[PDB]
Amino acid sequence: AGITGTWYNQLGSTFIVTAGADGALTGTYESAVGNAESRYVLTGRYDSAPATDGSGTALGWTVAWKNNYRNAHSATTWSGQYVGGAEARINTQWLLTSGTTEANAWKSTLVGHDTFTKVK
């Protein structure tokens, strides 16, 4: 599967990911320091038997931005695919939804993209 390990996005954010044989993604967001106050849980799913036609491996995961120290009242989902080979990558599009009032629901969800590599 090649997914398990530490991944870094284009801005250097760090994600520790374990790909279970059953399709589970588990792990954490860590800060550059790895301090407890900036650690958040991630959970998701991936295709544990991808196509053998050189297609990437579809996946997704979520981080809710609460831990025992901080709560931003928001959550991000990343949707994408893992691409193996010499320079393995996870190419994703993300949505960041913040909890809002109904009046402010229109501005609840930011969109962007993250590309993850096994090197900083």
Curated annotation (Swiss-Prot):
Highest taxon in the source lineage: Bacteria
Subcellular location: Secreted
UniProt-recorded Gene Ontology molecular function terms: biotin binding
Domain Avidin-like, residue spans: 1-120
Motif, Cell attachment site: chain positions: 45-47
Keywords assigned by UniProt, alphabetized: Biotin, Secreted, Signal
GO cellular component: extracellular region
Coiled-coil segments on the chain, per record: none
Binding-site residues for biotin, renumbered to this chain: Y29, Y40, W78, W94, W106
Family per similarity comment: Belongs to the avidin/streptavidin family.
Function (record text): The biological function of streptavidin is not known. Forms a strong non-covalent specific complex with biotin (one molecule of biotin per subunit of streptavidin).
Subunit-level organization: Homotetramer.
The name this protein goes by in its record: Streptavidin
Biological source species: Streptomyces avidinii
Full protein: residues contained: 39 to 158 of 183
